[PDB]
From a paper:
We determined the crystal structure of mCherry-LaM1, mCherry-LaM3, and mCherry-LaM8, with resolutions of 2.05 Å, 3.29 Å, and 1.31 Å, respectively.
Based on the interface structure between LaM1 and mCherry, all three complementarity-determining regions (CDRs) of LaM1 contribute to the affinity. Figure 2C demonstrates a short hydrogen bond between Lys178 of mCherry and Ser104 in CDR3 of LaM1. The KDs of LaM1, LaM3, and LaM8 binding to mCherry were 12.9, 30.6, and 36.8 nM, respectively, by BLI. In DsRed, the amino acids corresponding to E158 and K167 in mCherry, which interact with LaM1, are replaced by R153 and H162, respectively.
Residue numbers in the entry:
A (entry chain A), C (entry chain C), F (entry chain E), G (entry chain G): 6 to 65, 69 to 222
B (entry chain B), E (entry chain H): 4 to 129
D (entry chain D): 5 to 129
H (entry chain F): 5 to 28, 31 to 43, 47 to 129
Write the structure that this text describes.
């Protein structure tokens, strides 16, 4: 009964984007085996953010991914010890975001500690000018390699005028204790901003993710 | 693990075209970024170009811009091409393709940062 | 002798975009064997246009395409009779542009007659909101089929916000008299808006196009 | 252009299935492809379609969220109909059709497509 | 500049012979290497054969060896002949002669590396 | 108000190159704050010119230079009265071009008067033999000195065989009335011959220039 | 006074034949207007060479060619700046040698820099097995084309057995500075190995060459 | 602009001596060399370095070149020195080099103090 059908989490993010440092604190809950989750994030320091919230939204949880019975949920079995992941997002216009994360279980709830660095975003770009409006539904290709789980995503941000803005994302997931690596498979992800106040200092997110074979 | 095998080189004349291929094989599931390098007989490996692991970003050395073109093969995994148009005798070298997980500004032009290398193929422009 | 190394052309476009009708008259010149051309276009009726000029710019000339010796120039060989072409441009948000064109040779200079229809463009989309800023360089893959020359282009419009706005273009080129068809090859195209007044009633364009094998 | 379909069969409610539409020939053109299903007695009904370049996909209302159409990035003029969360109402003969370009007025009309596959049977118990 | 003029094509029956000629003209002083290509009504230009600029080397595609013969005219500058024996329906194509300065392994079979081409002549074998 | 975002100009040049007199009249237009401009030049006297057009192309306009906000646009602020400039261009093979120019504003459009003198070009050189095809992209180093604006350019012409033909250019820009001078900065210039007839009696040019800090 | 009646030269060759790298340093002298020259070559790296010296001998000097009065000596006039030449040598059995060379005048003597690549020589052929013995007297057909001087030779290598090993040679000679090109003419060349040690690491060469009208 | 020369002294015939002219403005200046036993013209180099000029009596032996890094600093490399070379050597600067001014000392504005070169 380590990973229950209902689980809350707390997340803390320390970040810097084009030199603007900030902290975010959040609380969330979801049903990990149904692949659904919600959270409410608050910019606790350095607000209001002068950049698009959308570059931060995917850094706030792959334990909440619905799996079929024949795919080993590598990240669920890593608990109670947990796992870490490291991510690089490369944007089409030169913007770069690097993320490291620690995931542990304390008092029956997940604790997420996130560190993010974003650089080289053009001053007139959609990220810095806050011209994005959400991620298109994406597909993460997950595969084992070098004793770790890895994921590749080609993600597209919708823009307010009606265009798109592309990023290439690679993530490495590693359990603290060695657990069974799964075969290669895909993860369909839909990430929605369900609500936000005017200056995006309080944001609510909802995510549905499910794994399937190639 | 990746094994890179290049082909498509040889002897051409000034102004001709030549498409180099870098066919990869192996047990890996990863899509790798790919870099092209060239080396004169008594020089070091010079950066020619690079394409990101997803193909969304391509970078070119200045002395080949407008003439050279790297592209990924959407059909075959981790195989890329170097299309060389309007060749010059300056372009004579052994050309190499190399693979790496991700491209960064500070690493994509340094040959020592790539883990997997092709055997090299000879491109002579007379 | 028919197609000189320097050739002028005149172009007239009658068109409608989302119910707004207009006429454009223009004169141009270029070097057909070097693949370069310029034109000055003037909105003579229905100005100022309430939509992005960029959907009209690729409709004002493939006789100005540099070819290697091993690629027969289908469209050049069609003169003095000339050729016609028909094109549908499908944008990623449902916008549609259909074009029919007649190309003839009169008094040693090309005469272009264009009819354009643009429909299904969203009222808040980048086209009706004039938030585009030029075409990325493109590559038209052309091939023979059924006594005609066809071309497929995946084209990308740049947006002022910094995103991209994609179009799929299919064109059929038909010589008025049977002339020899070439094999399949690619045409690299770069189209620049070199100048324009405040409301885009006087627009200058410059295009460089060259053929190469796939 | 000859369209060859495959991947049909008998499944149960909730199961998944993937249909393939593999073309073959000396054609140079990339074709837009549409999927139609026909229950016995009824006529061919629109399921979905994909533009010739793959940038646009359209879906019938009764399959939105469960069916997914995609082109094969490796094989020319080869599309897949990925069917998830199948229901008995999805039982039909499924056809893939090809045409030059999709328009709003012709993409849901079977008689507007030039080439067709032999069709494959999908039965959801 | 050189101008290649082809002739000798037409309709024949299977098993028959045919002789194509490639006559050149121009101010040029150069002896050019010459290659023959053929293009089916729905395909690209395929390498048939080529002869070096001095006549010392001749190369043939596998599907024409023994049946096709290429030779230079020792009396007329840059004039070559393609003798096609034992013709088969598969040989139906429009045939081209092309010229370039020198033949290399990596260029002799690629149409884009040739700078001068003839008008082409139809060869139909029933 | 004075310098609109779209501006036309007329140019007249009287010149002598290796003792060959000629006259050129031109009409142009461009967008002075975006740094782009085009022009159509016509040889009205002394045509066809027996030398390379490329030595004349950079004499036909630095009001059309895109500037950042922190760089005072010395030449733009000089209008409506305008400014003059004088230029020495020294080629590597001994050829020398001297240019004096007067820039003024009449009836909402720029008026350019150019006086050019070229000498000492060798008879077998690429300029006299017309063996050049266009300037490579250049960088003009700008700086104030003695109450005027000065510029230094290392320019390279492309030769017919792929070689290069170098020139060193020094220019002094002087506002007719005292106007704030900027600091030191660079101007990236790209000058294209977009079209020309057989004997270069009708020539079209297109230039993009933008300022940046050192 | 530039090209004197007696002129020395130094030559360096960097070569590779069938993957075998080598370097050769040489010193020579001759009488350029009489068409005679000698040289002593020394293999300084990669000796002894496993292939026949004869494929290298014609790469070590066409300024030493006797010319009648009515034949402009294109290569002599190119100095003191000098000239470059590029060569392809195609042998009858598929052997290929390509050479690039830079010729210049420094301190009153010619400087030759040679880069050579030989490939595709059969391992049992005469070149790889050292079965040749000297070139036969040849006649280079020279003619102008595309602003440069070109030469064609049908050269014959004598075999130790008794036969002949044929090769077709094409060379392009280009002056660094444009000089007067000649008409078409022939150059008779006799190249002799005057001495050599056992392994051909030290070789003496003599060549006599004279131009004649067709 | 202030021109400071250096590198003179006594040398034997056939030795080698390098003179340096260092400037202490945003402008790149053309620089020429003179010598006085009236000041006679020795050589000059354009402001960008693309052109160099030499008096006939020093062609082949003397070489002028601009330093790549240090602005407005040129060198006069002297080889195969002769007794006819002994003089006070001056460097000077001007905006641009012209055929009519580069050999005339009056047309130069800034000058160096001048170093002595004695060929014994």
């Amino acid at each position: 009964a380590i990973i229950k059908e209902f689980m809350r989490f707390k997340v803390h993010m320390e970040g810097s984007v084009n030199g603007h440092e900030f902290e975010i604190e959040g609380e969330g809950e979801g049903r990990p085996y149904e692949g659904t989750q919600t959270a409410k994030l608050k910019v606790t320091k350095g607000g209001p953010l002068p950049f698009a919230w959308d570059i931060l939204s995917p850094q706030f949880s792959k334990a909440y991914v619905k799996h079929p019975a024949d795919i080993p949920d590598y990240l669920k079995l890593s608990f109670p010890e947990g796992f870490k992941w490291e991510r690089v997002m490369n944007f089409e216009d030169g913007g770069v975001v690097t993320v490291t994360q620690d995931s542990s279980l304390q008092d029956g709830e997940f604790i997420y500690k996130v560190k993010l660095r974003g650089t080289n975003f053009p001053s007139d770009g959609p990220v810095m000018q806050k011209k994005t409006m959400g991620w298109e539904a994406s597909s993460e290709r997950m595969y084992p390699e070098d004793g770790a789980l890895k994921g590749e995503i080609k993600q597209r941000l919708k823009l307010k005028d009606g265009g798109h803005y592309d990023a290439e994302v690679k993530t490495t997931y590693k359990a603290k204790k060695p657990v069974q690596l799964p075969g290669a498979y895909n993860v369909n992800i839909k990430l929605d901003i369900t609500s936000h106040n005017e200056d995006y200092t309080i944001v609510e997110q909802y995510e549905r993710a499910e794994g399937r074979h190639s | 693990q990746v094994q890179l095998v290049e082909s498509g080189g040889g002897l051409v004349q000034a102004g001709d075209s030549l498409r180099l291929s870098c066919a990869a094989s192996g047990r890996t599931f990863e899509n790798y970024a790919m870099g092209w390098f060239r080396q004169a007989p008594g020089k070091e490996r010079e950066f020619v170009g690079a394409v990101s692991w997803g193909g969304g970003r391509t970078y070119y050395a200045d002395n080949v811009k407008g003439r050279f073109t790297i592209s990924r093969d959407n059909a075959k995994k981790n195989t890329v091409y170097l299309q060389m148009n309007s060749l010059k005798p300056e372009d004579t070298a052994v050309y190499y393709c190399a693979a790496k997980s991700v491209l960064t500004i500070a690493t994509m032009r340094v040959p020592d940062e790539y883990n997997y290398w092709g055997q090299g193929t000879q491109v002579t422009v007379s």
